[PDB]
Amino acid sequence: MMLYIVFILSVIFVMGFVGFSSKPSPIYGGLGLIVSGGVGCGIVLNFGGSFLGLMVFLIYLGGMMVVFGYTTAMATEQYPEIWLSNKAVLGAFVTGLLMEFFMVYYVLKDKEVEVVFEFNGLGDWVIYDTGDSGFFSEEAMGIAALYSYGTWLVIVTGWSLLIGVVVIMEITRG
Amino acid sequence: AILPKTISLAQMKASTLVTNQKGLIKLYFLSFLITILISMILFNFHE
Amino acid sequence: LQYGPLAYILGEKATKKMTEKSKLITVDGNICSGKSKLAKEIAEKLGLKHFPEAGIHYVDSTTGDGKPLPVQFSGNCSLEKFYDDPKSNDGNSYRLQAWLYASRLLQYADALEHLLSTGQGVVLERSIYSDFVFLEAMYRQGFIRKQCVDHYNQVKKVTICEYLPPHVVVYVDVPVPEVQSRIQKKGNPHEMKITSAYLQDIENAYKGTFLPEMSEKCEVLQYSAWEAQDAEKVVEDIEYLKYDKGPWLDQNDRKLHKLRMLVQDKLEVLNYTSIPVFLPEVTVGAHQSDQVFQEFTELPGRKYRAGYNEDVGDKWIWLK
Amino acid sequence: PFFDVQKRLGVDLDRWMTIQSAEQPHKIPSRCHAFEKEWIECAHGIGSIRAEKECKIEFEDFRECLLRQKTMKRLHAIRRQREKLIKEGKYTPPP
Amino acid sequence: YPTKETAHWKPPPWNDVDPPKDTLVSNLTLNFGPQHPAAHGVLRLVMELSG
Amino acid sequence: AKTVLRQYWDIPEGTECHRKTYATTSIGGAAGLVVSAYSVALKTPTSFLEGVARTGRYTFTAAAIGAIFGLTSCISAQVREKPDDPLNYLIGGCAGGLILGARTRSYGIGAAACAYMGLTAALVKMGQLEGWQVFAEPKV
Amino acid sequence: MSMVYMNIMMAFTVSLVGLLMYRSHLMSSLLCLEGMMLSLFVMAALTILNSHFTLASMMPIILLVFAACEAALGLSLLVMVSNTYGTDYVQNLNLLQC
Amino acid sequence: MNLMLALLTNFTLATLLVIIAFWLPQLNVYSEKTSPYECGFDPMGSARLPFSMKFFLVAITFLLFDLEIALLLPLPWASQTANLNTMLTMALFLIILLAVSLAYEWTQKGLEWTE
Amino acid sequence: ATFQFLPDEARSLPPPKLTDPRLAFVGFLGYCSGLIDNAIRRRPVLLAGLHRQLLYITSFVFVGYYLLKRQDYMYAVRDHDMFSYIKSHPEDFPEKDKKTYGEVFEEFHPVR
Amino acid sequence: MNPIIFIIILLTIMLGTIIVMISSHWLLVWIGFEMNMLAIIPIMMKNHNPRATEASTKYFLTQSTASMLLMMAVIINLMFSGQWTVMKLFNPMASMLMTMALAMKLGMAPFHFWVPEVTQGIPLSSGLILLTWQKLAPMSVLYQIFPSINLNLILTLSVLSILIGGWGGLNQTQLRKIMAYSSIAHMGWMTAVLPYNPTMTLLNLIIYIIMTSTMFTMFMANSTTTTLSLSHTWNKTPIMTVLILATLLSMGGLPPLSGFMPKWMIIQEMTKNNSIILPTFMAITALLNLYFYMRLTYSTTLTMFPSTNNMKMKWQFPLMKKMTFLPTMVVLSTMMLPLTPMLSVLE
Ligand SMILES: CCCCCCCCCCCCCCCCCC(=O)OC[C@H](COP(=O)(O)OCCN)OC(=O)CCCCCCCCCCCCCCCCC
Ligand SMILES: CCCCCCCCCCCCCCCCCC(=O)OC[C@H](COP(=O)(O)OCCN)OC(=O)CCCCCCCCCCCCCCCCC
Ligand SMILES: CCCCCCCCCCCCO[C@@H]1O[C@H](CO)[C@@H](O[C@H]2O[C@H](CO)[C@@H](O)[C@H](O)[C@H]2O)[C@H](O)[C@H]1O
Ligand SMILES: CCCCCCCCCCCCO[C@@H]1O[C@H](CO)[C@@H](O[C@H]2O[C@H](CO)[C@@H](O)[C@H](O)[C@H]2O)[C@H](O)[C@H]1O
Ligand SMILES: CCCCCCCCCCCCO[C@@H]1O[C@H](CO)[C@@H](O[C@H]2O[C@H](CO)[C@@H](O)[C@H](O)[C@H]2O)[C@H](O)[C@H]1O
Ligand SMILES: Nc1nc2c(ncn2[C@@H]2O[C@H](COP(=O)(O)OP(=O)(O)OP(=O)(O)O)[C@@H](O)[C@H]2O)c(=O)[nH]1
Ligand SMILES: N=C(N)NC(=N)NCCc1ccc(I)c(Cl)c1
Ligand SMILES: [Mg+2]
Q1: Closest by CA position to F76, among listed F101, F94, F103
Q2: Which among I26, I67, I74 has the least Cβ separation from residue J347?
Q3: What sign results for the dihedral spanned by CA atoms J164, J165, J167, J173?
Q4: N or C: which end of chain I has fewer CB within 10 A?
């Protein structure tokens, strides 16, 4: 069952998505997006990208903290909805869990499944590379190249973040 | 029924169908979901 | 350079020109209350530009050669006819008030433009902010209809919102019985037909709506008949005002640039004074409209844009 | 590109990341480097219409390297067959 | 072309500005004391808060 | 859609009219549902039952036009022994328009529907015989 | 494909359906946009890491950068919608029917 | 496995302490005890009512600035490149632009809380 | 050549005559713009600002000269590509033997 | 808004569009779209009113959704091709998602619902950018991926756009909403010919941009946003009514005006490919566009509607608007048909 770690995490990934896609109160929607960002970190980390997985987890922790503050200010009501409080929320939540459950059940039983498309259920390990013995991290060298190869990328993203500051000040001024 | 009166009436009738909307974000994006579904389920535009 | 974003970028900013003396002053009061005398004397002592009260022919005085045009080019609206038969079938009563508000609207834009571009204050006699008192007086007396007031409020709503109110609202209080008497001494036969109920409605509007409203946003100085006579004592009150309220405290060069862009473009100022609302009193049929517009372009100096009419002496047109 | 200013000005704004056989930091090769090289060199200069037919052999191999779908069917069939024998007592995996 | 569904439609404002609403921008009310370190124990300071 | 249209097109005209009705009723029923889905989504019904009731009407009406066309057209083919005749579809297309008029309870609509649906159906048969392409494949 | 791809694509589809099926809170839907990025980030990262396509290792980072710009712009509009109406309900944003 | 064992142990022990805390003490529950606290008087309105955010603009800016650190974190690795001329320029270019946006928001009064 | 308005090979084509009727038309469009510019701004249409009216004719002619030069080049390229292809594939463009109407049979349709 | 800030943002709207058009990498194309969206929202919110806020929100939600389907298509393409080059996609699902993403960005039916509402809710000058400059980036992508586009999908979007654009405009009195449904109808023509001759997609896009700018610039000139206010123009600037009549007849595609050129050349390329029914259907359905263009001519130029007394005050003031390029654009909108062979420069 440990050879299926990446699949188990991906199951929780979907459960988190169903958690906030059913759209309860954004307080709980934020929590589900945090859980998905946590296992998502673990999924990416298990393919050799510890930096990428840790970054997305860190970035989404900051984003959801601001969303929480905005929720208490602009998206609250007397009785915030949990997943059981509303039929539409519960119905959407139940439907997602059942769809995920039957996908997991059949892919595990057959070691293969067709959910619209063909997916192989042998486990994710089978596709891994077999010949790693370099004395560095390939993810790090690729990311570190943003400052040498990716001059043009640095310019457009750097400009866009500056414009983002300018634009949010225009939008939010009366 | 090549009458101008009938032709102009069908366009009038069709014009009211197209334009008489509620202006609600929720209903528009709901119809997007319907369009995507049938684009695959009914016409196999995805293949 | 004509004023615009480029000129603003290069340094032309309203805060440079403006000072502690860049003020917009308005003198209000009933009819024959002494406004004009007081306003003219305030302007000289403080060294401000004086705009006489905007009449029917104010627009003429700012375009062309400055002389009044024949009345058919202002719609035949007449003040005298209003006093003779204010309940006329031809709707002259509301056509006048609608025209007068547009004239006041244009004068306010000119006044603001003078202040912003040169920094010098201005003195006005009534304004778009007090023009409604005549509307209410007309309605109470049954001179105009409910629809006309609705139309007036539509136009006022989408035009007065763009501007800033005066810094100072000088007001002269002269009770109706004295106003009555001061009218006969004027000797205009048409004015003497004015009823006192009409003048009372004017007073009630000023003291009922105008002054209470303008107190929250401007400095309001009220003077009696004799108080108003010493213009020097009025100027003394103005010179020591605190100026600590109203929207002028919130104005920065970004806002005053946008404001100055509006007031220098007169067709943008007057845009909504002709909204397509078809009241009988202000609607003109196609044939009358077309025929009069042909006459207007036949007036000296009016066929072409100013500076391109060589029937009045313009030169170098082939290089302009 | 709609306007190939990069190839006009001799400037490389983004062609360096377009393919995985491009020059990588410290000469670290992608897993499917050989297949992509072979497919790209086959189809160079003849256009997509010809390449779709004439470079099919190289593209299917490259596709096989990328997604490994035929490899997993070969391994899935063996793993399923082996367990079908385990119960029947017809196979003993080696030590 | 008028219909039953569009009967309630009205032309937009001439200047494209709809009047500001007052849907309730209410303040938060808080009992600051009496039982409170900074209220000296017998001060019920009823305090209307925006943030 | 391709499958149902192929089934209708890939069986000989005028033979086995009970099958053809299955194909044209399926096309009609499907079109009625597509209208129901967009109509229900864009014009929210007041209740669940109204939304289902509206869906039933559109799906029934569209399917009824589909069945009658596929039946009227095929019966005339065997009756007249003219399998490859656009005239058969003109009758089949008109019969559909009459049903639309009855379901909409409007002679004017029923009269207009016949002319447009009858002539549209007749043109479709000509297109099949002549090889007319609606969405033509790029060639030059 | 691998069985992890089944779940990540499922996650993207779930958040897309959550996005297209609005309720009331505009904030709830802005979350679904953030979710859709998260699934796209994970799926892109897996493909790039598994193929060992080194230079592409930086584009998931770039993906996140413009997700924040997109989220920040969305929150800026939500603030302005809330100021006008006092809630973030999307049913209030229907003036432009007429 | 070491890390997952460490995480499982940490949160298990925390959960165990909560379980003891709730099942070991003697409970005495009634309405007045569990009512919300507000210094002795009953609260006025719900605590779920909107709470104005006066730093809303800074919070949005935090999003854009928090992504910058994700772009700047790889810099210790970027310093190993042979192409040191390019990285140093681009590293400094990014930081300067981050400084420019702070200067723009500062000067425009974006850092001051609304009233 | 990629992203070149006029590739180098276009120089071996004869440039458009400055008396090209199409160019004369482009100059006429420039003149019409100048008159419209006077009209919308309520200036004397024919006389006002001849310096401005002149820059209209010149700018239209200047821009229109190079558009015409590239137009001609792109049709020359089309023909060059087409004729070369016909030379590369003789079997797809065979030379039929043309019969005379004395031999070819055509049906007669009387108009009665 | 500060004038320098307005210029910088406006250049960023253009910069994002340029990035899309010069990029060879799908990620940079996606970046160009995000940059363009980030810079156009502040131009919609410029006048700060509840209608601008609504329009900006509806625009952001539609564009943000489309961008997400675009990126999904890109990643699927990377999965099945291991490359990022902007060209034909290598997966039919990727093509469908990218095609729908670009249809949403363009506002093509049935993804069209936002175009009339966003256009109505923003100032005329912002609507001009929306209905013209914002078409360039999505079209430049379609121009490059059309070999893998599903023919049934693209032609269905074309047909629906022409019908819905034609029908939607019949019910409108707001000029900004008439231009929105006109835009939807014209997008259908550009994509209808794209599978057959992409050069004619460019020709139709260019001429549409010229004519659309000409109309918006003349609406801006008199600050008119409704039919009735536009009907007062004859009593202010008679010349402006003749220019509007000529441009509206051209948009309607009447010979011998410029706007007939795209319809003429698109019909030609489709009949070379044995497509007779579709271009015949498209031309007849375009008569819907001509009908609600003709009404604007009747109330503007060919009759004289009632005026108001205050209109006389406007006679004394000259037009002050910049009206940039209006003399040149109006001549290009009407008198280009004799120079049609010049279309080969786009080849
Ligand atoms: C060899 C050239 C043959 C000419 C071919 C003309 C083809 C149409 C060209 C379209 C451009 C026309 C000029 C643009 C309008 C400007 C003129 C105007 O608006 O009013 C007329 C004006 C006189 O009025 P005013 O305002 O007082 O100016 C004082 C100057 N005397 O100015 C004048 O006195 C005369 C200015 C020209 C008047 C143009 C008349 C309208 C032409 C457009 C109608 C359609 C043209 C015919 C269509 C078939 C195309 C051949
Ligand atoms: C060359 C090959 C290509 C051929 C294609 C066809 C070319 C057409 C190009 C059209 C370009 C627009 C140029 C139109 C110029 C018309 C001249 C004009 O506008 O009339 C002058 C007058 C201007 O008024 P104003 O400047 O304010 O001075 C006071 C005078 N009233 O205005 C008025 O006062 C008139 C007010 C009454 C309105 C009457 C409207 C009916 C006349 C319409 C004629 C124009 C029709 C254009 C459509 C195409 C025609 C073929
Ligand atoms: C709006 C919702 C969007 C949700 C997105 C959902 C995820 C989309 C997954 C895209 C990948 C689907 O993958 C699809 O299945 C298999 C993959 O081997 C392929 O299968 C098909 O093509 C290949 C050709 O080489 C062969 O297997 C075979 O000819 C055929 O079966 C399809 O060509 C491919 O399109
Ligand atoms: C036969 C093959 C070719 C035929 C082509 C004919 C297409 C139609 C051309 C005319 C279109 C006119 O469009 C519109 O038609 C109707 C009637 O017809 C007119 O409407 C008029 O007739 C109707 C009914 O007769 C009256 O209720 C209405 O009061 C009256 O205004 C509209 O004022 C006109 O604007
Ligand atoms: C062979 C190809 C034929 C091409 C036809 C070209 C399409 C032309 C489309 C015109 C459609 C709009 O035209 C519209 O027709 C209806 C017909 O009733 C008219 O409507 C008229 O009759 C109805 C009732 O019958 C009245 O309620 C309405 O007050 C009256 O005006 C509209 O006033 C007109 O605007
Ligand atoms: N109906 C109407 N009459 C107006 C308006 N403004 C001025 N008038 C009239 O114009 C005439 C002169 O203006 P007044 O200032 O009020 O009278 P006055 O004699 O000049 O007395 P002074 O205030 O000292 O200038 C008065 O008879 C007014 O009734 C107006 O906005 N509406
Ligand atoms: N129809 C296409 N898909 N391609 C296209 N636009 N032209 C293809 C043929 C062509 C036509 C004119 C010229 I001038 C040239 Cl050089 C080449
Ligand atoms: Mg006076």
Answers
A1: F94
A2: I74
A3: positive
A4: C
Alpha-carbon span C12 to C23, nearest angstrom:
19
- CB A39 within 8 Å of CB A10: yes
Domains of chain H and any CATH numbers? 7-107 (1.20.58.1610)
Q: What are phi and psi of D4, to 5 degrees?
A: -85, 65
CATH number (domain holding residue G15): 1.10.287.3510
Does B21 sit within 8 Å of G96, measured CB to CB? no
Domain A4-169 CATH class label: mainly alpha
**D3 interaction partners in chain I (CB closer than 8 Å):** 3
Residues in chain D: 95
Tokens 């099942």, located at residue? H23
Cα–Cα distance for residue pair J327/J54, rounded to 1 Å: 34
Residue G91 covered by a domain: no
Query: Which residues of chain B does G95 touch, with a Cβ-Cβ cutoff of 8 Å?
Result: 23
Q: For residue F13, give the 3-state DSSP assignment.
A: coil
Say how far apart CA C284 and CA J305 lie, in whole Å: 9
User: Which 3 state secondary structure label does DSSP give J77?
Assistant: helix
Domain residues of chain A, as ranges? 4-169
- Return the bridge partners of E31, or none: E46
Amino acid (1-letter code) at residue C2: Q
Residue E3, phi then psi, degrees to nearest 5: -135, 175
**Residue in J62, J170, J289 to test binding to B, most B beta-carbons within 10 Å:** J170
Q: Which residue is it, tokens 């000119």?
A: C110
Number of domains into which chain G is organized:
1
Is G68 inside a domain boundary?
yes
Residue C123's beta-bridge partner residues?
A: C25, C50
- Parallel, antiparallel, or unpaired: how do β-strands A117-120 and C24-29 relate? unpaired
Cis status of the peptide bond prior to J110, with omega within 30 of 0: yes
- Resolution (angstroms) stands at 2.4
Beta strands in A39-157 (DSSP E): 112-115, 117-120
SS3 percent helix, strand, coil of chain J, rounded to 5, is: 75, 0, 20
Residue found by looking up tokens 């004439």 in the block: D54
| Cβ C204 vs Cβ C152: under 8 Å | no
- What is the gyration radius of the CA atoms in chain D, in angstroms? 21
- Under 8 Å between Cβ of C102 and C122: no
**Cα gap C141→F36, rounded to integer Å:** 60
CA-to-CA distance for J122 and J119, rounded, in angstroms?
A: 6
Residue G90 within a domain:
no
Closest alpha carbon within chain F to J280: F134
Q: Is residue B41 lining ligand 4, measured as CB closer than 6 Å? A: no
Which subunits sit against I, judged by 3+ Cβ pairs under 8 A? C, D, J
Technique that determined the structure? cryo-EM
Task: Enumerate the β-bridge partners of residue C171.
Answer: C28, C222
Beta strands in I1-112 (DSSP E): none
**Beta-carbon contacts of residue A77 (< 8 Å; ≥ 6 apart):** A25, H48
Q: Which residues of B touch F118 (CB under 8 A)?
A: none
For residue E49, what are the β-bridge partners? E28
User: Hey, what are J278's tokens?
Assistant: 């579709």
Tokens 């969206």 belong to residue? J37
* Cα gap G50→G59, rounded to integer Å: 15
With CA atoms as reference, the chain G residue closest to H55 would be G79
| Token pair listed for G49 | 């890491």
Is the CB of residue F71 less than 8 Å from the CB of residue F32? no
Distance CA C35, CA C52 (A): 10
Residues A67 and A60: their CA atoms lie apart, in Å, by 10
Among the atoms of ligand 3, which is closest to the Cα of residue J92? 35
Contact A138 G15 (CB under 8 A): no
C256 membership: H or E segment, kind and range: helix C253-264
Question: Around F86, how many Cα atoms within 13 Å sit in the side-chain half-sphere?
Answer: 14
| Residue C304, phi then psi, degrees to nearest 5 | -115, 170
